[PDB]
Amino acid sequence: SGFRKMAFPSGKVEGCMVQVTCGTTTLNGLWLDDVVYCPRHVICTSEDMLNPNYEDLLIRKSNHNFLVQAGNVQLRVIGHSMQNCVLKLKVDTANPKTPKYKFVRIQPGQTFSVLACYNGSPSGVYQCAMRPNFTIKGSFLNGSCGSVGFNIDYDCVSFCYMHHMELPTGVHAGTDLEGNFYGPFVDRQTAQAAGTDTTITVNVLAWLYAAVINGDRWFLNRFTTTLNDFNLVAMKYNYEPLTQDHVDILGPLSAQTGIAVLDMCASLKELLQNGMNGRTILGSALLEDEFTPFDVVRQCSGVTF
Amino acid sequence: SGFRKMAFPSGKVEGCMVQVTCGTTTLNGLWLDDVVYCPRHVICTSEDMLNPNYEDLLIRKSNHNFLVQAGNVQLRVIGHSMQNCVLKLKVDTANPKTPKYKFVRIQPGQTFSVLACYNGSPSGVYQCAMRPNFTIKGSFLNGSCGSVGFNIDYDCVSFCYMHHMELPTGVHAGTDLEGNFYGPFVDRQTAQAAGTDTTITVNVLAWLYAAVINGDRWFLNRFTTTLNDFNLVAMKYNYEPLTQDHVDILGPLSAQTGIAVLDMCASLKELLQNGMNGRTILGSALLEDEFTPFDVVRQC
Ligand SMILES: O=C1N[C@]2(CCOc3ccc(Cl)cc32)C(=O)N1c1cncc2ccccc12
Ligand SMILES: O=C1N[C@]2(CCOc3ccc(Cl)cc32)C(=O)N1c1cncc2ccccc12
Ligand SMILES: [Cl-]
């Protein structure tokens, strides 16, 4: 029993974190095989950030301008290239701790673990969801750039996020490991803002199933609803639309608990229209949307890595 | 910016998790140097869980009755001894991945990371706190016994918890790594219950300071309180008493934010009286008590 915000074990990723310094800027790099990936903004001064021409700034750098430190060992940079907003530093040593890995770009609503790092040293691990507005509500201080987000599927680490910036509202923006930003963000010190966010409906439903599995049923009711009537309610309360794909994905949890997905939608509809009435669900007074249906099944079944 | 429930990176502990089997029971063990630590209840059969005589059950076991698996490699048990409720299996191989470590017994209110494991394989990491009633609100299924709780301040792993059981309310009980249970619990299936739990006041205050550091001040007020009046009010909401030790511990956060501890106590009193009025504090509609003053300073 119990339901916690759980991250994947971070050990496979910890063995890849390195420190990357370029001039006065120090941030984190991800060392996989003979390449260290890091935000391309490591080459910018504060003034360069106002309107950077990364190709022009990079052509001026030599390999020896990138100091890469893996623990207390300096790696030698033997080449450098840019892919979108990520800099790829070719090093002379393959990381012996390189796990089986892939680079995957995730969709909004998908969750991942973030290994927050400073100076190439991991400091904490937490679970995030890619918000519908393409930001993440992370916990990052100055020096955290280059920290990565990932999932593990069996023995394979799927890297999905690399940290680049903090927006004025305190939320975060980054890229996939191919350097493509999530969301309409750019790596430049210019006016940027997180758009209006929405709640990840399929994830709230998954968490209500987790609550039922853990013995909380107060919110259940005799009612059901159609997908169109529920979607009219979701639109009204700034919830993401629930698709037939989401309903199919929730099938296993629907079969296990005996609560049909649309039956749980009628529970969610009543919660949106009336609130919790002083009650809590899994120790929360808010509807939690950062657990996917897969996370719920994984935690309530004990899948290991 | 941002404030998350953050666990320590688990890699140093992942390299210590092993599977321990005795008869039909399989659980997790913590392999450090040449010793595998695990709950002594691994030696119990179906007829032993109500009034086990662990000394009597253990004397009957030979080293080859303990099957220890580290990855896909069977470790050879060459000795065994019991220390309180933990079994210590001496193995013929020191764990090459043994980190710098210590065993620390924590006090209620302290937080730690849990690396939940099944069959010696880590499945997830989460943060939790030792509740005032000596239980933890963990996430553990059958087979999670032997999963450990730890902190990793300054590259040294301080192991503070080893999981043993789930109480009827769904909360969890365990021991320190010397096998001493936290709370009045016993490794027996006899009727046991978590005592009435309370909110960790010092941690709620620490989290309100985190909220102020992160730019949220809506809950502040023009009032202060005496420590004793605060406690009289707080006790009525099932909050733990706030001691002068807690006030001293909150000194650094008070100096950083400019909000006196007793002024923050007045804000807490008002939050208890009023609720949040549709507002949130650090993304929460409830007052969070699983961040210590030390965690707040570490994360901010
Ligand atoms: O290190 C950087 N450089 C920044 C600052 C300048 O403006 C930009 C503009 C674009 C880009 Cl891609 C990065 C940056 C940025 O946000 N971060 C930070 C990342 N995350 C958290 C931060 C917490 C406090 C302080 C800075 C943090
Ligand atoms: O593995 C065990 N053995 C138990 C079962 C019998 O009663 C006792 C009594 C004393 C002791 Cl020390 C252990 C045990 C126990 O609680 N757990 C479990 C631990 N944690 C979570 C569990 C989630 C579901 C099911 C069982 C879980
Ligand atoms: Cl302590």
Side-chain angles (χ1 to χ4, degrees), chain A residues 6-10 303-305, chain B residues 10 114-118 121-126 139 148:
Chain A
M6 189 177 288
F8 282 99
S10 58
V303 175
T304 68
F305 313 92
Chain B
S10 59
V114 170
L115 178 66
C117 301
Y118 299 88
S121 289
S123 52
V125 62
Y126 59 84
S139 175
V148 299

Side-chain angles (χ1 to χ4, degrees), chain A residues 32-231:
Chain A
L32 292 170
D33 298 306
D34 59 351
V35 178
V36 170
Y37 300 84
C38 77
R40 66 179 181 173
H41 71 71
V42 68
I43 72 181
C44 304
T45 307
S46 284
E47 178 89 347
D48 288 330
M49 286 304 295
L50 305 178
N51 188 22
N53 185 312
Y54 288 101
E55 179 193 4
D56 192 69
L57 293 174
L58 191 61
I59 200 64
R60 306 172 186 266
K61 304 291 180 187
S62 65
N63 296 326
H64 283 238
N65 285 139
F66 296 101
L67 301 178
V68 175
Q69 193 166 323
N72 298 108
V73 172
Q74 203 198 309
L75 299 179
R76 88 171 283 107
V77 172
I78 66 164
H80 64 271
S81 73
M82 186 165 289
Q83 176 179 15
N84 304 310
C85 308
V86 152
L87 186 57
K88 297 190 290 183
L89 303 174
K90 201 67 150 162
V91 293
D92 80 336
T93 302
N95 183 358
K97 301 189 190 191
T98 302
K100 275 196 57 201
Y101 78 93
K102 264 192 293 192
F103 286 169
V104 307
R105 183 175 177 85
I106 61 164
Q107 296 295 307
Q110 294 196 308
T111 60
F112 56 95
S113 301
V114 171
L115 179 65
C117 302
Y118 298 87
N119 299 293
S121 164
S123 53
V125 61
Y126 59 84
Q127 194 65 1
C128 276
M130 175 57 62
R131 304 304 311 170
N133 69 1
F134 287 108
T135 68
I136 74 173
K137 291 174 166 176
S139 175
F140 291 120
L141 302 174
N142 190 25
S144 60
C145 297
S147 294
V148 300
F150 63 97
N151 284 292
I152 308 174
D153 176 41
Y154 306 115
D155 56 343
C156 185
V157 179
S158 292
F159 291 102
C160 61
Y161 178 85
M162 175 169 273
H163 187 52
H164 281 69
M165 64 188 296
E166 183 171 293
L167 292 161
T169 52
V171 305
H172 302 101
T175 70
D176 57 27
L177 269 293
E178 297 179 72
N180 300 288
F181 259 94
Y182 285 98
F185 307 107
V186 300
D187 51 355
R188 157 170 41 140
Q189 172 55 268
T190 190
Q192 303 186 71
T196 59
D197 203 23
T198 50
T199 302
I200 311 152
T201 313
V202 65
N203 287 7
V204 172
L205 291 167
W207 171 85
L208 289 180
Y209 279 113
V212 175
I213 292 172
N214 281 273
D216 220 335
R217 301 175 73 89
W218 68 259
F219 50 85
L220 301 177
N221 63 32
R222 67 159 59 233
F223 305 112
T224 195
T225 181
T226 62
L227 196 59
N228 196 55
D229 281 346
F230 178 71
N231 277 318

Side-chain angles (χ1 to χ4, degrees), chain A residues 245-299:
Chain A
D245 227 63
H246 295 145
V247 175
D248 293 352
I249 287 165
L250 291 163
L253 287 169
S254 163
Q256 181 189 335
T257 61
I259 306 294
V261 177
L262 291 172
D263 178 354
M264 190 69 91
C265 279
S267 271
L268 182 49
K269 174 209 273 193
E270 299 306 313
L271 290 177
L272 290 175
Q273 308 173 342
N274 301 275
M276 292 207 189
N277 282 308
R279 288 167 295 203
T280 61
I281 296 171
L282 290 172
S284 175
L286 295 174
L287 300 173
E288 170 72 63
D289 73 346
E290 298 202 352
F291 293 100
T292 69
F294 303 102
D295 294 341
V296 171
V297 166
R298 196 180 299 119
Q299 186 173 167

Side-chain angles (χ1 to χ4, degrees), chain A residues 1 4 14 125 139 290 299, chain B residues 4 7 11 139 166 290 299:
Chain A
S1 312
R4 281 282 183 184
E14 293 172 52
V125 61
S139 175
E290 298 202 352
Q299 186 173 167
Chain B
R4 279 282 186 184
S139 175
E166 183 169 294
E290 296 204 350
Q299 189 173 164

Side-chain angles (χ1 to χ4, degrees), chain B:
Chain B
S1 174
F3 204 79
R4 279 282 186 184
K5 197 142 273 221
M6 187 179 286
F8 283 98
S10 59
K12 287 174 169 61
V13 181
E14 292 172 50
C16 303
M17 304 308 307
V18 298
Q19 186 192 68
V20 177
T21 302
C22 187
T24 181
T25 299
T26 287
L27 44 67
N28 307 284
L30 179 67
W31 180 28
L32 294 170
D33 298 308
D34 59 350
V35 180
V36 170
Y37 300 82
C38 75
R40 67 179 181 173
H41 70 73
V42 70
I43 72 181
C44 296
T45 73
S46 60
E47 263 93 29
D48 298 314
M49 223 47 227
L50 278 156
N51 291 291
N53 186 309
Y54 289 101
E55 178 192 356
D56 193 70
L57 293 174
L58 190 63
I59 198 63
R60 304 173 186 267
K61 303 291 180 186
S62 65
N63 296 327
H64 59 268
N65 284 139
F66 295 100
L67 301 180
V68 175
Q69 194 168 324
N72 44 55
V73 172
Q74 203 199 309
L75 299 178
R76 190 171 67 105
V77 172
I78 66 164
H80 64 271
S81 75
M82 185 168 52
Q83 176 179 14
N84 304 308
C85 307
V86 294
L87 186 57
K88 298 189 291 181
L89 304 174
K90 201 68 150 160
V91 292
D92 212 34
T93 302
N95 183 358
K97 300 188 193 162
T98 302
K100 278 176 186 182
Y101 77 93
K102 45 170 61 182
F103 288 168
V104 178
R105 182 177 177 84
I106 61 166
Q107 295 297 307
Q110 182 62 267
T111 60
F112 56 95
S113 301
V114 170
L115 178 66
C117 301
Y118 299 88
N119 298 293
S121 289
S123 52
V125 62
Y126 59 84
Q127 193 70 348
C128 71
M130 175 58 59
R131 303 306 308 171
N133 70 0
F134 287 105
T135 68
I136 75 173
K137 289 176 165 175
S139 175
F140 291 122
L141 302 174
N142 190 25
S144 61
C145 300
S147 295
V148 299
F150 62 97
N151 285 293
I152 317 179
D153 310 298
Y154 194 50
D155 201 63
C156 176
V157 180
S158 51
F159 291 101
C160 58
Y161 178 85
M162 174 169 272
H163 186 51
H164 281 69
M165 63 189 296
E166 183 169 294
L167 291 161
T169 52
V171 303
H172 305 102
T175 70
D176 56 29
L177 270 293
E178 297 175 298
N180 293 122
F181 259 93
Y182 285 99
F185 306 108
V186 295
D187 51 355
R188 283 162 74 195
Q189 212 170 167
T190 196
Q192 299 184 75
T196 58
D197 203 26
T198 49
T199 303
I200 309 152
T201 313
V202 65
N203 286 7
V204 173
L205 289 168
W207 172 84
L208 290 178
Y209 278 112
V212 176
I213 292 172
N214 279 59
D216 219 338
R217 300 177 50 99
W218 69 257
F219 48 85
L220 301 177
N221 65 31
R222 72 172 184 92
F223 303 112
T224 194
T225 182
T226 65
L227 181 55
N228 198 54
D229 281 350
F230 174 74
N231 287 325
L232 289 168
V233 170
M235 249 105 283
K236 299 172 192 183
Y237 298 92
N238 274 339
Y239 267 56
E240 279 293 292
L242 192 75
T243 64
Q244 185 52 218
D245 265 15
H246 297 145
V247 174
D248 293 352
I249 288 164
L250 291 162
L253 287 170
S254 167
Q256 183 187 336
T257 62
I259 304 164
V261 177
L262 292 173
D263 281 19
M264 195 57 92
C265 289
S267 173
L268 182 46
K269 286 162 75 184
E270 188 164 277
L271 283 167
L272 292 173
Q273 167 188 276
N274 293 352
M276 292 204 192
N277 239 53
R279 288 167 294 204
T280 60
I281 296 171
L282 292 173
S284 176
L286 293 180
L287 303 175
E288 174 68 59
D289 74 345
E290 296 204 350
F291 293 101
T292 68
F294 185 99
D295 292 343
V296 170
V297 165
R298 158 221 190 203
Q299 189 173 164
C300 300

